[PDB]
Design an enzyme around this catalytic site. Structure first.
Site, PDB file in Angstrom:
ATOM      1  N   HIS A  22      12.265  11.729 -10.457  1.00 43.14           N
ATOM      2  CA  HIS A  22      12.089  10.330 -10.137  1.00 43.14           C
ATOM      3  C   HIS A  22      10.730   9.874 -10.484  1.00 43.14           C
ATOM      4  CE1 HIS A  22      11.135  12.629  -6.538  1.00 43.14           C
ATOM      5  NE2 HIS A  22      10.134  11.783  -6.389  1.00 43.14           N
ATOM      6  N   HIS A  78       7.340  11.813  10.101  1.00 49.36           N
ATOM      7  CA  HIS A  78       6.601  12.964   9.534  1.00 49.36           C
ATOM      8  C   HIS A  78       5.889  12.572   8.219  1.00 49.36           C
ATOM      9  CE1 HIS A  78       6.102  17.344   8.422  1.00 49.36           C
ATOM     10  NE2 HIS A  78       6.103  16.836   7.214  1.00 49.36           N
ATOM     11  N   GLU A  79       6.633  11.912   7.341  1.00 49.07           N
ATOM     12  CA  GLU A  79       6.105  11.500   6.058  1.00 49.07           C
ATOM     13  C   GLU A  79       4.913  10.575   6.178  1.00 49.07           C
ATOM     14  OE1 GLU A  79       6.537  13.211   3.590  1.00 49.07           O
ATOM     15  OE2 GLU A  79       8.102  14.298   4.552  1.00 49.07           O
ATOM     16  N   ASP A  85       0.841  -1.201   0.000  1.00 49.39           N
ATOM     17  CA  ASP A  85       0.000   0.000   0.000  1.00 49.39           C
ATOM     18  C   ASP A  85       0.880   1.256   0.000  1.00 49.39           C
ATOM     19  OD1 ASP A  85      -2.593  -1.161   0.219  1.00 49.39           O
ATOM     20  OD2 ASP A  85      -2.149  -1.657   2.291  1.00 49.39           O
ATOM     21  N   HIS A 134       0.184  19.526   7.263  1.00 46.88           N
ATOM     22  CA  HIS A 134       1.088  20.209   8.162  1.00 46.88           C
ATOM     23  C   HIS A 134       0.332  20.925   9.257  1.00 46.88           C
ATOM     24  CE1 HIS A 134       4.433  20.066   5.000  1.00 46.88           C
ATOM     25  NE2 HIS A 134       4.745  19.250   5.994  1.00 46.88           N
ATOM     26  N   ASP A 173       2.378   6.559  -0.823  1.00 44.51           N
ATOM     27  CA  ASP A 173       3.831   6.376  -0.947  1.00 44.51           C
ATOM     28  C   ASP A 173       4.671   7.530  -0.388  1.00 44.51           C
ATOM     29  OD1 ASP A 173       2.677   4.186  -2.371  1.00 44.51           O
ATOM     30  OD2 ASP A 173       3.961   4.553  -4.142  1.00 44.51           O
TER      31      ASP A 173
END
Ligand code: 0D3
Ligand code: CA
Ligand code: CA
Ligand code: ZN
Ligand code: ZN
Length: 158
Positions: A63, A113-114, A53, A123, A89
């Site tokens: 990228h 955080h990601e 997932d 945020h 992702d």
């Protein structure tokens, strides 16, 4: 509110950063997912391959996603909101110095955080929150989620 309708989510570390050992990268990522687990109903499962997932990778400049990284410092990584495909992702800039110390940057904290973004959080303006736009080192040894972040996943899930 984009959110996952499922509670057991899988993840896959597509590649590694040579700066850390694989064990250290896998440990950074594991622990980052556990900060969210303990404050929400989500369970995270690692798969060694296959479609997960949440794909985790270390990429450079262009990228493939229209969100090119930018060389050292500046933006450190990015993640996509809950969803199919690229959804969920998280990409890290391969050009940063990843550490597991207080030296810039500490992977566990940027991963933590990601993963918040991957779960649907944006945020926060609270400088004490992990979801704050800019990075700040915080001891990670027995690190736990700031109350503001806890308020954030609780409001999406339960
Ligand atoms: C602006 C940039 N922010 C980012 O790269 C965030 C993009 S979602 C990632 C982040 C934010 C807070 C804590 C850990 C990771 C940053 O903090 N750069 C490093 C700097 N402070 O020198
Ligand atoms: Ca960068
Ligand atoms: Ca995905
Ligand atoms: Zn990307
Ligand atoms: Zn962010």
């Amino acid at each position: 509110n984009p959110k996952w309708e499922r509670t057991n989510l899988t993840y896959r570390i597509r590649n590694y950063t040579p700066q850390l050992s694989e064990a250290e990268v896998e440990r950074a990522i594991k622990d980052a997912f556990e900060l969210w687990s303990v404050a929400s109903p989500l369970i995270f499962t690692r798969i060694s391959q296959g479609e997960a997932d949440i794909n985790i990778a270390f990429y450079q400049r262009d990228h493939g996603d229209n969100s090119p990284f930018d060389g050292p410092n500046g933006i450190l990584a990015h993640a996509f909101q809950p969803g199919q495909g690229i959804g969920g992702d998280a990409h890290f800039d391969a050009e940063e110095t990843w550490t597991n110390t207080s030296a810039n940057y500490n992977l566990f904290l940027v991963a933590a955080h990601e993963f918040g973004h991957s779960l649907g959080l944006a945020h926060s303006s609270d400088p004490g929150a992990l979801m704050y736009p800019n990075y700040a080192f915080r001891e990670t040894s027995n690190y736990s989620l700031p109350q503001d972040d806890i308020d954030g996943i609780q409001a999406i899930y339960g």
